[PDB]
Subunit: 323 residues, 2 copies
């Protein structure tokens, strides 16, 4: 009945239209070391994040899940300023990123000491049930992430701790899959450890363009997310045209009660600014929070997808996920 | 001639007795994600750090080089409080740790963009000549680090950028070698890119117990540091008995003008506290800032090492290094 947002508990029935995966802030681990040339400018960053929230609201979005990992610059107090300013519900995560682009040395060291997995569970419980740091904000989701072609020994500690914490709390799990791999394996591994499929979203499933891989994942009874619309050419991503093709195949198969959509935007980058060289910059030009509404949903309706199906994905599914 | 300390420029002739490698604070990358259970308690940490500084002062230390990497919790403003409270000269570093236990995703991403190496050089120059973040503090050394048996392509970006910054500034370079590997290779690679051997300290050389390896490094004209006294068993480290044996062999050969000593202490760990299991805790019991003075130096004196050679290593060498 309630879910924890950065402004406290909100009834699940009031979440309304939701984007299941976007970042207001994000940095690659190591951004902290480039603080001199890459300082976090609070005022300007807040203006940018607020403008992003305002754009989302213009398209009827009432709730965003921001699954920024703990080791990637997660800042709940900043998210609260955005929500307090805009009235958008923002739900944040507890979790670490995958080994390949995360910051594994700290918990790798605790693994060597023999405490890491219990420590991770302790962290999850604290952040889900007590609060993050001194912010008073509880996470509403656990974020998990795996590597390309395998769930590493490091990552599996977090998967196990997540299943444990979920059993205790009923918290939703949101995942990252890398380059269209491990969707089935993530679902299997979590359910093998007692997690509830109706509380799991296997993420970045748009990264794979073979609909049998999606069907295999969907057979576990989990949610999947096509959550990187607008990301093309980069991080091994297929095109939006390929995402749409794959998505249409599944909707025409009747899977709409298991699918959610999003962009995985990064609205403010932590660390030093950068510009993408061509041709990448042109390929990435639609990576923004209005793209689903301006471009993708019209293309879906232009291929016969009806409003009730879209509403199932954006409103119905988040309501069920968090219930 | 001056060197930049956390309190501003200090004449090199006033550095006096120096510990070339100690950490007041240090965290394994990822510690930031465990903020809820592993919070930074600034008062208590300052008290602990000040107490370490007072211990060093009692053995006549006036200056400490703290080469904590930028991605391992470096905190120049905290160091300044330690210095202000104690009158100790503290010199800090600019640099990133080795790939294996650092936070490489950030600059790996910039490498994809084509700018990483130039960005690293720019960071070095900013921090050596302008200031770190908004603290007004300049670094007095560049910290470099390599992996076990390899200077990786990520690491070499920093090595090349350091040689470049050193040519422009005359800055001192201090390095980390992993598990007694790559000393000769580091010296050779830096020299190949125009760095000045009289401004280079190859660190953790006590990690290798074969004096031939030391002489190969010494042949480049660089300083070497036996800087992990008291670390035994962990991190592949030899015993202090082995360190001393190796050091005496080199002092027999007359290399004292290229050698410096330290402990590489971590006086305050960032993140959540931990306990070492026995047997390691017992092996590690002498890892503290007084060990060189209470235990090691007296053993060297027992063996007939003259005060002038000890003074060369602790006073003469740092003066020459920074001149
Ligand atoms: Co992701
Ligand atoms: Co994401
Ligand atoms: Co080191
Ligand atoms: Co060190």
């Amino acid at each position: 009945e309630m879910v924890e947002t950065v402004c406290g508990p909100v009834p699940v029935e009031q979440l309304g239209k939701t984007l299941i995966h976007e970042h207001f802030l994000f940095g690659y681990p190591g951004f902290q070391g480039d603080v001199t040339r890459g300082t976090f400018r609070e005022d300007e960053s807040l203006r940018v994040a607020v403008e992003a929230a305002e754009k989302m609201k213009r398209h009827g979005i009432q709730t965003v899940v921001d699954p920024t990992p703990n080791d990637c610059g997660r800042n709940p107090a900043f998210l609260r300023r955005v929500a307090e300013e805009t009235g958008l519900n923002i739900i944040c995560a507890t979790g670490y990123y995958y080994e390949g682009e995360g910051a594994p040395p700290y918990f790798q060291f605790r693994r060597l000491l023999g405490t890491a997995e219990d420590d991770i569970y302790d962290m999850f419980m604290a952040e889900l049930t007590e609060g993050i740091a001194d912010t008073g904000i509880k996470a509403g989701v656990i974020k998990l992430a795996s590597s390309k072609g395998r769930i590493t020994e490091y990552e599996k500690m977090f998967f196990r701790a997540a299943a444990r914490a979920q059993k205790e709390t009923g918290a939703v799990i949101i995942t990252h899959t890398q380059e269209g791999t491990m969707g089935p394996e993530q679902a299997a591994y979590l359910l093998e450890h007692g997690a509830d499929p109706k509380k799991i979203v296997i993420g970045h499933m748009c990264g794979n363009t073979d609909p049998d891989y999606h069907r295999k994942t969907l057979a576990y009874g989990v949610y999947i997310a096509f959550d990187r619309f607008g990301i093309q050419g980069m991080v091994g991503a297929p095109t939006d045209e390929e995402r749409v093709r794959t998505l249409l195949a599944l909707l025409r198969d009747g899977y709409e009660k298991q699918i959610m959509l999003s962009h995985d935007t990064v609205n403010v980058w932590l660390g030093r600014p950068f510009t993408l060289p061509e041709p990448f910059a042109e390929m990435m030009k639609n990576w923004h929070v209005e793209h689903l509404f301006v471009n993708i949903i019209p293309a879906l309706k232009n291929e016969g997808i009806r409003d009730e199906v879209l509403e199932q994905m954006f409103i119905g599914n988040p309501a069920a996920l968090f219930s």
